[PDB]
């Protein structure tokens, strides 16, 4: 009942990106440039299907440096991972919630079995707990 | 002698992102959040392998909006496209250069056979006229 580290996530479908700057309510700790990645299974959910067991969403969070009016990606801060399993992750609405510090499998960030993650993602129950929207 | 519209580039490997903000010397026309994509052939060349003919790099440029210390992706402004053909695009260092307004296949932008594009990209002869570097 631990989220598997999503090996190869970096080769998945890039869903969207956002910059969270200092002053954002979520600055600690989602401050930075982030990219959302979906595996094949998660794409079915993003396209308007039911999220199937084995869907994985990853949010990939980088530091950035403001250099002469460019924001330039620096070090990877962490990844967030949502792993679909309606049974095993039933306590958090069928998604397993995990963080990996610097995107390393040995740096698990989640210490409450994902209740805090779920507490915010709950606001999106009607879109199956996923904020990101597919775009061209 | 024309660069093909890179159908499906949104499914390709996401190489990197950067934000160019007001004040940047390249604000016209490179202002916004841009995402770099690489097909399989392009990935070979980015890894320090060589670029096969049919390698395609895309730079996907979005407008952004400020939204309470978040930069949020808005409308697509354009895509830039580099298509590898050592012989056919030999006048511009073996890469064909094209822009598509709003990434629409019908809004081709380049009028000088890509000499303008190649001029800036020539700074990067040492790495085959590619600025982007693979990251983790
Ligand atoms: C609100 C106060 C949040 C808490 C606590 C957590 N997340 Fe979150 N998450 C949030 C938003 C507003 C977004 C969308 C960002 C965007 O670019 O639109 C996200 C996104 C994710 C993603 C990408 C999938 C998606 O739902 O869009 C993942 C994989 C994700 N978040 C995981 C995650 C984990 C593991 C958390 C606990 C450590 C967590 N999030 C907390 C808002 C909030
Ligand atoms: C300098 C003033 C530039 C001119 C004119 C053009 N491009 Fe460019 N390009 C430039 C930089 C500094 C970068 C890297 C951006 C980053 O995030 O690192 C790019 C990138 C591209 C890419 C992605 C591949 C790469 O080399 O990194 C493509 C596909 C690309 N640019 C195409 C392109 C075309 C078609 C142009 C003429 C319309 C063009 N570029 C002009 C700098 C400059
Ligand atoms: Zn403020
Ligand atoms: Zn600035």
Residue numbers in the entry:
A (entry chain B), B (entry chain A): 3 to 138
Give excerpts from the publication.
Cytochromes c′ (cyts c′) are a group of putative NO-binding heme proteins that fall into two families: the well-characterized four alpha helix bundle fold (cyts c′-α) and an unrelated family with a large beta-sheet fold (cyts c′-β) resembling that of cytochromes P460. By contrast, our recent crystal structure of cyt c′-β from Methylococcus capsulatus (Bath) (McCP-β) reveals a hydrophobic distal pocket dominated by two Phe residues (F32 and F61), a structural feature we have named the “Phe cap. Proposed roles for cyt c′-β proteins include protection against NO stress generated during nitrification.
The F61V variant exhibits Fe–C distances of 2.01 and 2.00 Å and a similar bent geometry to the native ligand–bound structure with Fe–C–O angles of 166° and 177° for monomer A and B, respectively. Similar to the wt Fe(II)CO complex, two orientations of Phe 32 can be seen in the F61V crystal structure. However, unlike the wt structure, where a unique Phe 32 orientation was seen in each monomer, F61V displays two orientations in both monomers. RR measurements of F61V and F32V Fe(II)CO complexes support our hypothesis that the local negative polarity of the Phe 32 aromatic quadrupole limits buildup of charge associated with Fe(II)→CO(π∗) backbonding, thereby weakening the Fe–CO bond. The pair of ν(FeCO) frequencies observed for the F61V variant (483 and 495 cm−1) are similar to those of the ν(FeCO) doublet for wt McCP-β (481 and 491 cm−1), with the lower frequency ascribed to CO interacting with the local negative polarity of the aromatic quadrupole of Phe 32. Crystallographic and RR data confirm that NO and CO ligands interact with the Phe 32 ring face in the F61V variant but are unaffected by any aromatic quadrupole in the F32V variant.
